[PDB]
Structure formats: C-alpha cells, structure tokens
C-alpha cells in the first residue's frame, strides 16, 4: 500500500536548484547527512535521560557508512530518534518550507550551496549526488516506514516489509552514474576526516 504525496511547491523548487545548478563541491552532502544523524542521536540520548525505556529498541548510538558498488548505493545508518509517519508527510515539510525560503533568499546576496545546513535543509544536499533517495526509518512510537523520491515534485511513503531495525534512519543514496567516487573507501575517509572529524558518536566506515 504505497501512498504518493506532492512535495510542497517551495521544496520542489529547492530540489531542482540542487539537481540542476553547477556546483562542483558535492561532498558536503555527506557531512550534512552525518550531521543529521548526529542531531538525531542527540535527540534520543536526551529523551532517554527521562525515559530509559526509550532505549529498549537499541542501546547503541552509532553512525554507519555502508558503500555498495554492486547496487550503486551509499547508505548512512543511524540509531537516532527516527521519523514518525507525520514527520515524513507533514512535520518535516512545514519546518523545511521556511528553511528553504531563507536558504534561497540568501543565494543571491552571494551565499553558496554549502551553507544549506544553517537553513535546516541539509538532507536535500543528497540530491547533489543521488538520482533517487530512499529513507528507511523507525520511531519508537510508530511502525517502520519507507520514504522515497527521485524528486520531480513528488515522493512516496509505505510501511516497510524489510529487515526490522529496532530504531534509527537509513538513508540510501542511489548515486548518479558520474558520482561513483563517493563509493570508494579512501574517498569516504577523506570527507569524514575533512568535514566530520568532531561528530559525537562512532562513525564506522564499512568496506566491501
Ligand atoms: C530523512 O529525510 C528527511 O530528513 C526529510 C524528509 C523525509 N522530508 N523532509 C526532510 C528533511 C530533513 C531535513 N529537512 O527536511
Ligand atoms: C528526526 S530523525 C532524522 N532526521 C534527519 C533529518 N535525519 C536523520 N538521519 N534523522
Ligand atoms: Mg556497528
């Protein structure tokens, strides 16, 4: 039972700017996602200080980077707070709608694309490198869901029949054919050390 939702107008505009603009410096996509996982780990750590039962779905707080040349994907996996179904459909768009307008208004005035994080929309930097993004995510309060979009103004949501994951977010990045460099162990190490040396959680880079 796959449901299809149109992106709010503003967001669909952002996602295009990212997909079509000439920007050579695409590696920022990673520290954004990694940063995003970190914020998500942060939220659960804190919540669990008052509710130790919130960690009954996973005590380990970590980020994994999992490259896959075969199915041409880079995945960032976190055991963060994860996203309820309302997050995916309603909430995160409402935050991101203001987030975008600010980001966009700052783009003439001469800020660049790498400052996307300060505007609350780093997630979308994933489109600098991916042709389609899939998001597996599990919140304590809701069931497990698959979100997915290849942009073009729309995105789907479905309850997921995959491996259960206790709690977290997987972000599967289905890379564009000219972006397979973000699949290489040495290349990933370089961006992690360069942009994310001071993340507060173990980032394991998997090898093949
Ligand atoms: C996991 O991907 C996301 O976080 C997401 C979705 C599914 N919609 N909007 C957003 C978002 C994140 C940050 N700003 O927006
Ligand atoms: C609320 S959970 C979340 N959110 C984001 C933007 N990212 C991640 N990894 N998790
Ligand atoms: Mg591990």
UniProtKB/Swiss-Prot annotation:
Where in the cell?
Answer: Nucleus; Cytoplasm; Melanosome; Cell membrane
- UniProt gene name: HSP90AA1
Q: Coverage of the whole protein, first to last residue?
A: 16 to 223 of 732
Q: Where is this region: Interaction with NR3C1?
A: 1-208
Family designation: Belongs to the heat shock protein 90 family.
- Any idea what job this protein has? Molecular chaperone that promotes the maturation, structural maintenance and proper regulation of specific target proteins involved for instance in cell cycle control and signal transduction. Undergoes a functional cycle that is linked to its ATPase activity which is essential for its chaperone activity. This cycle probably induces conformational changes in the client proteins, thereby causing their activation. Interacts dynamically with various co-chaperones that modulate its substrate recognition, ATPase cycle and chaperone function. (Microbial infection) Seems to interfere with N.meningitidis NadA-mediated invasion of human cells. Decreasing HSP90 levels increases adhesion and entry of E.coli expressing NadA into human Chang cells; increasing its levels leads to decreased adhesion and invasion.
After translation, the protein is modified as follows: ISGylated. S-nitrosylated; negatively regulates the ATPase activity and the activation of eNOS by HSP90AA1.
Q: How does it assemble?
A: Homodimer. Identified in NR3C1/GCR steroid receptor-chaperone complexes formed at least by NR3C1, HSP90AA1 and a variety of proteins containing TPR repeats such as FKBP4, FKBP5, PPID, PPP5C or STIP1. Forms a complex containing HSP90AA1, TSC1 and TSC2; TSC1 is required to recruit TCS2 to the complex. The closed form interacts (via the middle domain and TPR repeat-binding motif) with co-chaperone TSC1 (via C-terminus). Interacts with TOM34. Interacts with TERT; the interaction, together with PTGES3, is required for correct assembly and stabilization of the TERT holoenzyme complex. (Microbial infection) Interacts with herpes simplex virus 1 protein US11; this interaction inhibits TBK1-induced interferon production.
Q: Where is the signal peptide?
A: none
Q: What is known of its domains?
A: The TPR repeat-binding motif mediates interaction with TPR repeat-containing proteins like the co-chaperone STUB1.
Instruction: Give the source species.
Output: Homo sapiens (Human)
Which positions bear N6-acetyllysine? 43, 69
Record's protein name: Heat shock protein HSP 90-alpha
Where is ATP bound in this sequence?
36, 78, 97, 123
């Amino acid at each position: 039972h796959v449901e299809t939702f149109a992106f709010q107008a503003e967001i669909a505009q952002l996602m295009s700017l990212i997909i079509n603009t000439f920007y050579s410096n695409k590696e920022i996509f990673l520290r954004e996602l990694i940063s995003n996982s970190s914020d998500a780990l942060d939220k659960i750590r804190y919540e669990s200080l008052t509710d130790p039962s919130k960690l009954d779905s996973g005590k380990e707080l970590h980020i994994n980077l999992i490259p896959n040349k075969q199915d041409r994907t880079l995945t960032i996996v976190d055991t963060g707070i994860g996203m309820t179904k309302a997050d995916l459909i309603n909430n995160l768009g409402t935050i991101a709608k203001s987030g975008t307008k600010a980001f966009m208004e700052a783009l003439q005035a001469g800020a660049d694309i790498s400052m996307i994080g300060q505007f609350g929309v780093g997630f979308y930097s994933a489109y600098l490198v991916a042709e389609k993004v899939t998001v597996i995510t599990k919140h304590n309060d809701d069931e497990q869901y698959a979100w997915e979009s290849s942009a073009g103004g729309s995105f789907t949501v479905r309850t997921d029949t995959g491996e259960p994951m206790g709690r977290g977010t997987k972000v599967i990045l289905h890379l564009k054919e000219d972006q397979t460099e973000y699949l290489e162990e040495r290349r990933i190490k370089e961006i992690v050390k360069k942009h994310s040396q001071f993340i507060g959680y173990p980032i394991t880079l998997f090898v093949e």
